[PDB]
Amino acid sequence: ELPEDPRWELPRDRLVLGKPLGEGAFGQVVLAEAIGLDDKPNRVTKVAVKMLKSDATEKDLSDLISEMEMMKMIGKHKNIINLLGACTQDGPLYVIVEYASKGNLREYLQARRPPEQLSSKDLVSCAYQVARGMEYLASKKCIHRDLAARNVLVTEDNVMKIADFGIDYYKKTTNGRLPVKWMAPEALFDRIYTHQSDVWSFGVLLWEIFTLGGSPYPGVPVEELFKLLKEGHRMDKPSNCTNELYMMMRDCWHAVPSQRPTFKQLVEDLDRIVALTSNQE
Amino acid sequence: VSEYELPEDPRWELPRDRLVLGKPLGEGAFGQVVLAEAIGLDKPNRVTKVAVKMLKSDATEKDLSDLISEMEMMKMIGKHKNIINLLGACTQDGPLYVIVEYASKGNLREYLQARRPPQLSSKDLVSCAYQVARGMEYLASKKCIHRDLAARNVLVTEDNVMKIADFGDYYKKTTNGRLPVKWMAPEALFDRIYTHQSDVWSFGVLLWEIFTLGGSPYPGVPVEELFKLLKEGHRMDKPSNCTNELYMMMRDCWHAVPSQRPTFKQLVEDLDRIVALTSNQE
Ligand SMILES: COc1cc(CCc2cc(Nc3ccnc(NCc4cc(C)no4)n3)n[nH]2)cc(OC)c1
Ligand SMILES: COc1cc(CCc2cc(Nc3ccnc(NCc4cc(C)no4)n3)n[nH]2)cc(OC)c1
């Protein structure tokens, strides 16, 4: 049995499960409809539901509870996937969260590549939102550890929402990419995970945005990536990316972690650049 | 026959006392290259600063054969401004010295690297591409396929003139530590078919090298992984400070179907037009 929390608990008869969305962290994610989440008790809200797979262990359960328990503490923000409720009693654990219909930022940016289109201002606005979301998480003393476009979900209203916050190097993703390519060197070589190692990952995410879902270091294996980092190599400036925005990526990848910008600084600069970026191209 | 004596060609032959050897320039193809001074090449008493290619002391009868062949080919190919031309030779009574034009500003890659901002204008960069294409178009008309067209094999003269050099194993790297497979067309790299259209692809990689101001192609990418990129039909990212017309030209050179790539005559025509429309103000 799991303990009951009435602040969040939803009766199972108020949740109609739909088509699966795909595999998530610590379990699988399905589309659902929740009858009366707030008044109105008669309104349906389209939501996302995470539960365990049939092959899951007592360890996989504890992980899912822990993530839910953390979301309770972290609190609400527009640019994070928020908790909406849970079915913890009389059956399997269903963690009810916000639903993002346009998938992950990688897929979204890829699907909108030229032969719907995004202007330069729209791309800067994507970076702004992720930084706003990360700055909130940082204020809650939370370190993501895997900030990438794949872990940023886009809603129907093009709002960016950071997913699964708070590992073998030769383990690839579903799309066949290597997650080591997003890691700060100190996290990779010294296993030191800080808000400053997440800032390095935001630098890789920025590159991902301005390349419209480009794969970082294509054809580069793990042993060769270490060689690039040790040599102090940095990714080439994307085409259709300002010198101010490349300067920003390079600051995020400052060799010295203490010399990198913070998320509060990134939010400030990105706010200013959005305002000065034309929506005419 | 060439073991004891080489045949004489008086159209090119120079007396050895008319050549004063100087500081070595580096290792070249089929031998080594040294700086030299030739007393009266034309007509008389004037010294011309030249480049001299000869064999290393450890060279074989096969290495000699190769050097003679390159000289013999240069005799056939004829003169052009955008190629390293033959000036003469010492073939008799001592080791073979192949006397050629001298390019003081080194190779295009080093040239472009040394001139990176912390200068060459956009028009200067397009002019580099134009010259290489003019040089390759001349070589193509002479039924010659380079097989290793890269910035490293393009010499730049005192007067900034581009000159193609040494015009004809996958895990063999260069002196600067780069992999030459990163310049070859897929047909040359899988079916071993080397054509003028293969040199058009290598010109595509050279153009990328120019607009990245001596950028290293696919950094940290090994050979087996490069094949995977080519088979997947991956194409290098558009460089920063490179027009969409110039990137599309790179992409045209990088066409999977060799017959659908532009020829050097087309490249010369388009570049001629672009140089004229490119501002020297930036
Ligand atoms: C901390 O953030 C989360 C995020 C999630 C992901 C829920 C989700 C899926 C979704 N929409 C889409 C769109 C396209 N493809 C998918 N696939 C499933 C998926 C995405 C992610 C991220 N994890 O699983 N979901 N929006 N919101 C679940 C969760 O449960 C404890 C907490
Ligand atoms: C078919 O084209 C050639 C090109 C050459 C290149 C000779 C050369 C070198 C040179 N100037 C410099 C300047 C700085 N560093 C070097 N390095 C030697 C070098 C580079 C390359 C390429 N070949 O030799 N050469 N000017 N002309 C020789 C030759 O003799 C058979 C035939």
Side-chain angles (χ1 to χ4, degrees), chain A residues 3 5-22 24-25 27 29-37 41-42 44-45 47-51 56-57 60-69 71-75 77 79-115 117 119-155 157-166 168-170 173 175-190 192-222 224-226 228-229 231-263 265-275 277-280, chain B residues 2 4 6-10 12-17 19-22 24-26 28-38 40 44 47-48 50-55 57-60 63-72 74-78 80-107 109-118 120-122 124-142 144 146 148-157 159-163 165-171 174-230 232-237 239-240 242-244 246-247 249-259 261-264 266-268 270-276 278-279:
Chain A
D5 187 5
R7 309 175 282 189
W8 293 101
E9 200 71 32
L10 184 83
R12 269 160 214 271
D13 54 311
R14 304 305 78 194
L15 192 72
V16 186
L17 304 177
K19 71 113 190 290
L21 288 161
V29 176
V30 309
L31 179 57
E33 278 180 306
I35 306 173
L37 270 165
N42 282 286
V44 300
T45 317
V47 300
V49 171
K50 190 178 271 185
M51 70 193 78
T57 64
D60 289 302
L61 176 56
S62 59
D63 291 355
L64 189 57
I65 301 160
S66 215
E67 189 176 21
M68 164 179 77
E69 284 312 296
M71 285 168 82
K72 296 189 182 179
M73 312 272 292
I74 288 148
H77 195 265
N79 304 116
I80 63 159
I81 291 291
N82 299 293
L83 183 62
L84 303 173
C87 306
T88 76
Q89 301 302 294
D90 328 297
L93 180 71
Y94 292 161
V95 183
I96 313 148
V97 297
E98 283 176 316
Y99 166 66
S101 56
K102 295 186 176 187
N104 70 57
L105 187 54
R106 177 209 110 245
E107 279 162 348
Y108 170 96
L109 290 165
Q110 282 181 342
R112 286 149 181 94
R113 279 169 157 179
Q117 286 198 174
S119 64
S120 276
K121 200 179 203 109
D122 295 311
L123 295 184
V124 188
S125 181
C126 289
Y128 178 69
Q129 296 183 58
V130 173
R132 236 233 221 109
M134 288 307 299
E135 182 199 31
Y136 181 76
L137 289 166
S139 87
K140 298 294 125 176
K141 337 296 209 98
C142 177
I143 284 111
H144 194 294
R145 295 193 181 83
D146 201 4
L147 178 66
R150 60 187 174 259
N151 293 319
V152 165
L153 289 171
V154 183
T155 76
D157 324 298
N158 314 300
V159 173
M160 303 300 129
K161 281 191 178 284
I162 288 143
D164 306 82
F165 29 73
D168 180 53
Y169 300 154
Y170 303 90
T173 64
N175 197 51
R177 295 200 198 152
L178 294 158
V180 291
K181 294 174 160 172
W182 280 257
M183 285 184 72
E186 68 277 358
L188 189 73
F189 307 128
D190 306 302
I192 298 154
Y193 280 99
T194 58
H195 291 120
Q196 300 163 336
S197 67
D198 274 340
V199 172
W200 175 289
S201 312
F202 182 77
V204 187
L205 195 139
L206 289 179
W207 188 95
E208 290 191 281
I209 295 177
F210 299 102
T211 55
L212 300 170
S215 172
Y217 292 114
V220 180
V222 169
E224 276 295 345
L225 177 75
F226 298 154
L228 291 173
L229 295 159
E231 275 171 347
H233 186 269
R234 303 278 172 271
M235 282 183 284
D236 300 41
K237 179 186 132 182
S239 20
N240 180 82
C241 166
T242 74
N243 286 291
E244 182 161 41
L245 281 161
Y246 182 53
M247 234 265 173
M248 185 183 283
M249 293 185 197
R250 297 295 303 261
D251 293 330
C252 293
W253 315 317
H254 197 289
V256 189
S258 60
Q259 298 309 299
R260 285 170 203 164
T262 66
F263 285 113
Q265 285 170 257
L266 287 168
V267 172
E268 266 181 40
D269 296 343
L270 282 164
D271 201 311
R272 168 189 60 77
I273 299 157
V274 185
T277 304
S278 192
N279 60 274
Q280 305 304 76
Chain B
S2 277
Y4 297 85
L6 269 64
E8 211 185 346
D9 188 5
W12 293 101
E13 200 72 31
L14 183 84
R16 270 160 212 272
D17 54 312
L19 192 72
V20 186
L21 307 175
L25 289 161
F30 322 115
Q32 61 146 338
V33 177
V34 309
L35 179 57
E37 277 181 308
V47 299
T48 318
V50 300
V52 171
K53 189 177 271 184
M54 71 191 80
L55 294 169
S57 87
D58 58 349
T60 64
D63 290 301
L64 176 56
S65 142
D66 292 356
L67 189 57
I68 299 160
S69 217
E70 189 177 21
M71 164 177 79
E72 283 312 296
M74 285 168 83
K75 295 188 183 177
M76 312 254 283
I77 288 148
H80 195 265
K81 192 193 182 178
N82 304 117
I83 64 160
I84 292 292
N85 299 292
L86 185 60
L87 304 174
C90 307
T91 77
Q92 302 300 294
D93 329 296
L96 180 73
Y97 292 162
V98 183
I99 313 148
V100 307
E101 283 177 315
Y102 163 65
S104 83
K105 294 186 178 187
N107 70 56
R109 189 260 304 162
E110 279 163 348
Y111 174 80
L112 290 166
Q113 282 182 342
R115 285 148 182 93
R116 279 168 157 179
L120 293 164
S121 64
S122 277
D124 295 308
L125 295 184
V126 188
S127 178
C128 289
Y130 178 70
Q131 296 183 58
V132 173
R134 237 232 220 108
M136 287 306 297
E137 182 199 30
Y138 182 76
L139 290 166
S141 86
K142 298 294 128 176
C144 177
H146 195 294
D148 199 4
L149 177 67
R152 61 187 173 260
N153 292 318
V154 164
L155 264 324
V156 186
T157 66
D159 323 299
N160 314 301
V161 189
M162 303 301 130
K163 279 184 189 286
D166 306 325
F167 27 86
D169 181 53
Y170 300 154
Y171 303 90
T174 64
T175 49
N176 197 52
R178 295 199 200 153
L179 294 158
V181 290
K182 294 174 160 172
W183 280 257
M184 303 160 203
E187 69 281 18
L189 206 102
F190 306 131
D191 306 302
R192 299 179 64 201
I193 298 155
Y194 278 97
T195 58
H196 290 119
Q197 293 315 95
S198 319
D199 289 355
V200 167
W201 181 284
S202 318
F203 183 76
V205 185
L206 195 140
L207 289 180
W208 187 95
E209 289 192 279
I210 294 176
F211 300 102
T212 55
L213 299 168
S216 173
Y218 293 111
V221 178
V223 168
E224 37 279 299
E225 277 296 342
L226 176 76
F227 299 155
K228 230 161 285 185
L229 291 173
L230 295 159
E232 275 171 347
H234 187 268
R235 300 293 187 266
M236 280 180 291
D237 302 21
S240 22
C242 166
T243 73
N244 286 290
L246 281 161
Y247 181 53
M249 183 181 283
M250 293 183 197
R251 297 295 304 262
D252 294 333
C253 295
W254 303 335
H255 254 95
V257 189
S259 61
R261 287 171 204 163
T263 66
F264 285 113
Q266 284 170 258
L267 287 168
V268 173
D270 296 343
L271 288 154
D272 201 309
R273 169 190 60 76
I274 299 159
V275 171
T278 304
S279 191

